[PDB]
Amino acid sequence: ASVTESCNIGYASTNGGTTGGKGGATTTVSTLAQFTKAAESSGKLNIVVKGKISGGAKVRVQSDKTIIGQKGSELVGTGLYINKVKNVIVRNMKISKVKDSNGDAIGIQASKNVWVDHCDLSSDLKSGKDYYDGLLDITHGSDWVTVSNTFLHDHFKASLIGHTDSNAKEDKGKLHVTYANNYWYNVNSRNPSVRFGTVHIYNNYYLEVGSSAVNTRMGAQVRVESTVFDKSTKNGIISVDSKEKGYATVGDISWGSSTNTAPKGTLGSSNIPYSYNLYGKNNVKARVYGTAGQTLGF
Ligand SMILES: *[C@H]1O[C@H](CO)[C@@H](O)[C@H](O)[C@@H]1O
Ligand SMILES: *[C@H]1O[C@H](CO)[C@@H](O)[C@H](O)[C@@H]1O
Ligand SMILES: *[C@H]1O[C@H](CO)[C@@H](O)[C@H](O)[C@@H]1O
Ligand SMILES: *[C@H]1O[C@H](CO)[C@@H](O)[C@H](O)[C@@H]1O
Ligand SMILES: *[C@H]1O[C@H](CO)[C@@H](O)[C@H](O)[C@@H]1O
Ligand SMILES: *[C@H]1O[C@H](CO)[C@@H](O)[C@H](O)[C@@H]1O
Ligand SMILES: [Ca+2]
């Protein structure tokens, strides 16, 4: 892999694309102080994270940044908050145990063109349901986001797209998100939960989902295909807990113990504005398990 690879997967590759800090300088950071100074700075910048950075913090990531983890690097307790910015790459990053007061592990709010690739995001299930918040939340009119090759695990409320039923003016017609080649393990709910948006899930492997996997809500259109639900709740794809229903379209699913009870939608193969490579449901576990997460070599 290369620091300057641009997004070539999903919705973040559209509407101008996502190049992060390409064109800027490169810095390597190994302390929280170095990291927040680099990430909160103005201008194009490539930030390589080295070693284990621990500390309770919420980092206000600015536009035109690439944040890349070295093998063996991680953030413990430090969340990335991507708010009213654009063109951000978060890649090969391991983030864990961000306390609720410090926000989400990755929180994307009112931002556009964001690529999360080969990340490893988790907390635990032993500290209470609200001790931690989200792993990867996308809200407040954000758009053109791709979550690819990422491992989301050991956590209650994983990924929220659209924060409340009352937010139509801001969220309707926005919140286009791709989930490509991801591995979800031992997560309880919001895998993802979607209000309003348009979400494409393909080549995902779900294992030991506790309460619900995909929840489609308030007119959302989700497409789930070439995807495996393994040893997971009956609530595989549902539409619940909102004032208006959402919709789902499916293809080439291995259901396991899970089912789809969401109303049929309209998001077909021909309605996706990018090219994508389906593995086939019987090959997803082999191609994703051990690849998703912080597995890149720079
Ligand atoms: C990514 O782009 C940088 C320049 O922005 C190159 O130096 C590198 O080889 C890669 O193509
Ligand atoms: C900083 O250096 C990196 C290589 O680590 C480049 O990829 C980048 O374009 C910048 O020149
Ligand atoms: C790269 O530059 C960053 C600041 O943007 C420093 O924190 C780091 O030590 C390296 O000089
Ligand atoms: C910061 O330094 C690290 C190694 O410590 C490099 O991998 C990185 O490309 C940047 O030069
Ligand atoms: C982590 O590593 C960086 C880059 O090597 C240093 O600048 C810092 O002092 C810490 O050792
Ligand atoms: C980024 O935020 C960190 C938080 O610890 C500071 O230490 C640093 O000076 C920068 O403002
Ligand atoms: Ca959240």
Side-chain angles (χ1 to χ4, degrees):
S2 164
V3 164
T4 59
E5 280 177 274
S6 70
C7 179
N8 62 337
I9 301 170
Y11 282 113
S13 78
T14 73
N15 286 267
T18 301
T19 59
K22 184 177 181 179
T26 307
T27 182
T28 294
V29 300
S30 72
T31 71
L32 182 61
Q34 288 178 341
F35 179 57
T36 75
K37 184 192 181 43
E40 300 184 340
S41 72
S42 172
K44 293 179 179 179
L45 190 63
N46 305 289
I47 304 162
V48 175
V49 176
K50 170 178 146 193
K52 178 184 282 188
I53 292 177
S54 296
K58 180 191 293 189
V59 184
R60 288 161 60 165
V61 179
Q62 294 304 293
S63 294
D64 307 314
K65 301 292 182 292
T66 296
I67 298 170
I68 282 187
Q70 291 186 343
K71 157 161 201 180
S73 69
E74 63 187 305
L75 300 183
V76 183
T78 290
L80 304 183
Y81 183 47
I82 297 164
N83 181 39
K84 291 178 180 181
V85 298
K86 58 102 203 176
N87 191 31
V88 174
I89 297 174
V90 185
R91 187 155 188 244
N92 214 46
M93 290 287 288
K94 179 173 298 171
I95 306 170
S96 66
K97 298 192 181 196
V98 180
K99 297 174 127 293
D100 178 74
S101 76
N102 288 309
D104 298 316
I106 300 177
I108 298 162
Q109 183 178 332
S111 295
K112 302 195 173 160
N113 298 87
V114 180
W115 187 27
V116 177
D117 184 56
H118 277 286
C119 291
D120 180 322
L121 309 171
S122 62
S123 60
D124 59 69
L125 299 181
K126 275 124 190 203
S127 307
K129 281 179 87 169
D130 303 314
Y131 188 95
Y132 312 101
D133 199 28
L135 294 176
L136 209 170
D137 292 348
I138 304 164
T139 68
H140 300 82
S142 295
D143 222 344
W144 326 123
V145 180
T146 292
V147 180
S148 53
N149 301 306
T150 284
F151 179 36
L152 305 99
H153 59 105
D154 297 295
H155 186 90
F156 283 106
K157 312 178 293 295
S159 186
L160 182 78
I161 298 175
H163 81 289
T164 188
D165 287 354
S166 299
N167 209 39
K169 179 62 173 171
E170 183 168 64
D171 285 341
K172 185 171 291 142
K174 307 284 197 208
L175 305 171
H176 293 83
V177 186
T178 299
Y179 290 88
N181 322 329
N182 301 304
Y183 175 21
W184 311 71
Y185 171 59
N186 196 32
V187 286
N188 198 54
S189 70
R190 310 191 183 171
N191 306 292
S193 172
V194 190
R195 294 177 172 97
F196 295 104
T198 302
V199 179
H200 185 204
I201 302 168
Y202 69 90
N203 300 332
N204 280 220
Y205 177 56
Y206 289 85
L207 176 63
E208 293 176 35
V209 181
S211 175
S212 57
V214 184
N215 187 12
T216 183
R217 327 157 72 149
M218 305 290 311
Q221 294 278 346
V222 184
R223 174 172 183 79
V224 188
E225 63 185 322
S226 183
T227 281
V228 176
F229 295 94
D230 186 355
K231 202 158 150 102
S232 292
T233 173
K234 191 168 212 213
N235 296 316
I237 307 175
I238 64 179
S239 179
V240 305
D241 296 346
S242 283
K243 79 186 168 163
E244 176 63 13
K245 68 196 196 154
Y247 304 89
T249 312
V250 301
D252 195 40
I253 306 299
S254 178
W255 284 109
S257 43
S258 307
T259 71
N260 175 19
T261 60
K264 184 181 272 234
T266 52
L267 189 59
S269 309
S270 65
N271 313 122
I272 302 291
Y274 50 79
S275 65
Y276 55 98
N277 179 34
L278 299 182
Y279 295 162
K281 68 185 171 171
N282 299 311
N283 312 299
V284 167
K285 186 178 176 183
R287 305 271 305 260
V288 171
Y289 181 52
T291 293
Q294 185 190 61
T295 64
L296 291 179
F298 303 85

